[PDB]
Amino acid sequence: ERVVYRPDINQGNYLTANDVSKIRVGMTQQQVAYALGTPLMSDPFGTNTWFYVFRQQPGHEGVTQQTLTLTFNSSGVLTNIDNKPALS
Amino acid sequence: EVPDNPPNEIYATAQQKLQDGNWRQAITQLEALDNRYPFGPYSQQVQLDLIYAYYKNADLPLAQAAIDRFIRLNPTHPNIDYVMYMRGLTNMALDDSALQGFFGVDRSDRDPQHARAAFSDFSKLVRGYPNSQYTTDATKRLVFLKDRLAKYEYSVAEYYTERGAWVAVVNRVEGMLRDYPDTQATRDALPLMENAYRQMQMNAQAEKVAKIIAANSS
Amino acid sequence: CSSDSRYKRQVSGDEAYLEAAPLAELHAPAGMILPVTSGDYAIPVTNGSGAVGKALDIRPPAQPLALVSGARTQFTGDTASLLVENGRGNTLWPQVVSVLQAKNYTITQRDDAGQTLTTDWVQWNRLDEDEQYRGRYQISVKPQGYQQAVTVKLLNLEQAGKPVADAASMQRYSTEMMNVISAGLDKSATDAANAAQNRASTTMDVQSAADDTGLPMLVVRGPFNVVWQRLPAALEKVGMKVTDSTRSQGNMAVTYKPLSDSDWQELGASDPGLASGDYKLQVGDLDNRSSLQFIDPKGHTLTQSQNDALVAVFQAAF
Amino acid sequence: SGNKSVKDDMLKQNLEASGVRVGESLDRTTIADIEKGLEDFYYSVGKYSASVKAVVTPLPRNRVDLKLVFQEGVSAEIQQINIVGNHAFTTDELISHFQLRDEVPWWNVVGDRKYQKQKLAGDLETLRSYYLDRGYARFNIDSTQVSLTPDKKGIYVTVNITEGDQYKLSGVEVSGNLAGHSAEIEQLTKIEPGELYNGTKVTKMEDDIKKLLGRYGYAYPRVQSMPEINDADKTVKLRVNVDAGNRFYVRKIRFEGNDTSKDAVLRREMRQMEGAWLGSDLVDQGKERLNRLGFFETVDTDTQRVPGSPDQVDVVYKVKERNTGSFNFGIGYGTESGVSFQAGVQQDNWLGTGYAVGINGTKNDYQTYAELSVTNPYFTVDGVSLGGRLFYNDFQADDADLSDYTNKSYGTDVTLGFPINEYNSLRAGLGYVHNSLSNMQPQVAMWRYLYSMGEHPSTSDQDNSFKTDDFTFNYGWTYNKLDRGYFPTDGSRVNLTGKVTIPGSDNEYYKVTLDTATYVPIDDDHKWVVLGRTRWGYGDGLGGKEMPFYENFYAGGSSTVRGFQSNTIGPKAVYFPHQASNYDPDYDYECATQDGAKDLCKSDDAVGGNAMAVASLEFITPTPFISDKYANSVRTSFFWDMGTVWDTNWDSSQYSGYPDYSDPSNIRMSAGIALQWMSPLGPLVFSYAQPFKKYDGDKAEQFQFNIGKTW
């Protein structure tokens, strides 16, 4: 291994520092979607949570992931921001 | 090539050939009888026999065209449920291969377009005419088609699990849960979703999926 | 290479779909829900009384045939009804009785005054069926309102010497009896019509009057059938022997043959000068008139002068 | 009836558009309409005076038959094409680029002076582009007049234009919502000082900006250029307004038409991940990889915006499956000296699983050849391949005695390939072969090799034997960038193969081969191509041994040099006198034998050599007479092939009188025509070649028929 060519497996939705800073508590779901774009992954079970995961795997270079979890209430108003810059 | 005998003789010959099982000559006789006498006492019976012969003769596109023509021309014919069932059969037949069937190849990974069309047609027949004599076979075929379509989604999710595309795996399994919750393929796919959640280090979602799996261990 | 009689009535495929695993719902653990189902692939819960697999007849249902007359015909469960041209007064019953006797079908009960009768067991012969069926029927003639119609009721069916209850066979054989009676009546009617047509000889006068397309046509003052039948002989007289023809399409083709001046005055009312290539002809249907259209081998239509030469008489040849 | 140019198919489709179709009713009021429409069509082509008149004949049971009598005239021919107002260029130069031709040179018999409205509109567009690409920036077509002689066979064309002045680009100013890629956009809007304005350059710049934005997920940007003209100094300043828009994400990737191929077989070739931001370059790469696979006749892509979503799309790849396989089969003997049969099964996509499975063999009274090969192109997700091969060849002569040239061979081979780039891929493997020769007819080359191996067989009697077990390490490298998989129209493929006997084998040697095939399109439609193909090969012993004579290279045939008998080019055998093991009544014995002379008389039996080099230049042209619907199922070409095989170890000092087979100068050549057809039994190749250059002993064969891909 380490010699077989592997393409880049980009997964998730693109996140930038400015974009992540553009969202603050009390934001409506539509405003968050406008600022960051429609998430590619939500919580299908009994919770109104949005997952903005940003994966990049260049291939034999290590995988880097930033995951932003946005928890809304029933009304659709943003209630909690949880930004994880890197994997553990 | 079809003689111009009176209509009764042509219909009798076509019926005799259909009974004998020679699909091609019966098809020729019925086509002659239909394109010579377009609107007569034989129109409906000849169209139904043409649909049946096209199906048995493996002329599936012609069978579909004839079925569409009959449905649009006679939307309220008493024997309309039979035409819907035949359309379902034709679409299900387009989703089969003999060479691969001989070798025992599971074709659930191939194009599911025709399976989807057959499912739509059979669902239409079952909902519209619950008391028809083709409803039980239609229901059995619907169950089989649902299982096959779920297996197709399972195949895609499994491939993306192999590739390392975790978001794609999660989305595919979520779509399976929303569309085919009660199939075996969804039960098989549930651990794939848990693994995809684990790899992305979202442990809460993985725990939720693990709880779902445990509650439905079987 | 090897086949069996039963491949005719079964579906093209296999019974694999009958072994598909059943669908079981998923239990939602406490404290959370499962994703909301789309409902696009929801299977309604129906009854499993009908046949499945190879035991289901996909043979098209037998629709009653309105052969004798174009009036309404309809089947409902176990009885078929067929209206007839007007009501034929009281002659419909004797006509149906005579057509019934044509097939030497036995009758046990008779209600000629009430227009009702019953038939003894009748044997059927179908290559489709592995085992031949049989059953009893009841035929009556009653007025449905402004017209007189014939109704048939299938008492029962029997195959392999055992009773049957499937609606498919019942409908099939009720329609079989109705179609047999109707085909007999229609055969009598069309024989009478053919005799009348043969008796009614038509004149063979020809004309060159054109139509909405603007071309002249070798019109003949007669119905389509007789003029079409006599046109091959007339074309043979002029040497344009027919090689291909289509009664239901009207199109026909001829071939050149050299005829001298004496031959042209013998029959054919002289030479139009068409002396090259394969020509084609078309006929019309006007119950007293009939247009004959000619086209050149190049694909064009003959001018009025070209065909006026034949129009001189063009009558003895027919 | 009567139509000589317009086919019945196009007419019939024109009928259905107007509602005239078999089984439907006859709308009399539309008759005039249809007629006029057809006449209009005939006028568009330039066939004025044509008439199309409909006749309705009444058929019984209230039916009609519609006959459309076509009477076409003589097509009008362009007498002149005049441009008025061209002072900078000349009419001849401007119309030389036109599709419509005012005149045709006597040598050119493939074009005519026929007229067509669509061609005229395209011609006006071409003229406008010609004048706008030279920096005029003000060219305007004031009017266009199409005249016609009173006899309606002399159509005339005239174009009144105004050139204006020649402008120069002062500078491109790009502004708008550039989405942070301004720096990479300024490099696409770089202009040389004082360069003349150019419309095509501006269009290319807009397309480049759109493509650059698309590579980052901005699938739907809007780029519009509004040049501001300044006549005071005749300078134009471009103003490119750019709005990137929203960044798009792929939601699902769907495959349609793969009724046989597995879904994973198509998905594994995708560079665009499903749940990730869109990249148009990645989608194009996936499409190109699918095309290069060769499993599908056609491949198309469709990016469909998800309804009710401003950020998500669905990429749909629509494929048309192709017959990937050959079934070569034949019988040679029938009833002469027993029975024989052959097999040729070869599948590149076995049951849609992606496996390459090929089994072929020949059973005769003297031969029992069998060969099986199975390779999985994706033994690992990344594309690591794992192949395997078994073969068993036998030669016994069906005599079960001596003096029969018994030759029994059998071996195994395992290969492992893996990519290193998007196009390059290496291969490493291990092979084992066992060869047992016996009762060999003495010859100079074979005896020389045997002496190199340390054996000392008698030169007179045929009694002899030789057993060798060889273990080889095989290596290879393939660079593949072909446009397609079966009928390439662009790109090059290079395949290098080689083997070396690892210590411990009976005989030590090395061998290497190098193929090459380059397709260069000259036509923009990729219908006329130039194919440069070559093949090279060299082998030799390592120690004091020599390369085995059964590993020699052979040339000449339907795969190397068309026009020569298979494996006929190269050195010819030279037989020593036998003086024993001779069958007087057989009469099949060679010159050097007891029945014949007692010298080293040279024969005509090709033995091959340890060095080979063949080249070939081909011109691919469209099939002269074939419907365009089956254009990609048949290929016609004109080829010129060259080839030579020589034995570097041939000792010219000895055997001076006999030909020197170590000279690579003797180059055979051939020229002819070849036709390839993708029949149900795979590719069938017919070729007629004349070998205008040949040497003594070369058996010519002008007409050749072959089954399966030649190369």
Numbering used by the authors:
A (entry chain E): 24 to 111
B (entry chain D): 26 to 243
C (entry chain C): 25 to 342
D (entry chain A): 100 to 810
Sentences from the study reporting this entry:
After their arrival in the periplasmic space, the OMPs are taken up by periplasmic chaperones SurA and Skp (seventeen kilodalton protein) and subsequently transported across the periplasm to the OM. The insertase for folding and insertion of OMPs into the OM is the essential OMP β-barrel assembly machinery (BAM). BAM is a multicomponent complex consisting of five different subunits, the integral membrane protein BamA and the lipoproteins BamB, BamC, BamD, and BamE, which are anchored to the inner leaflet of the OM. SurA bound to BAM can undergo a large swinging motion between two states.
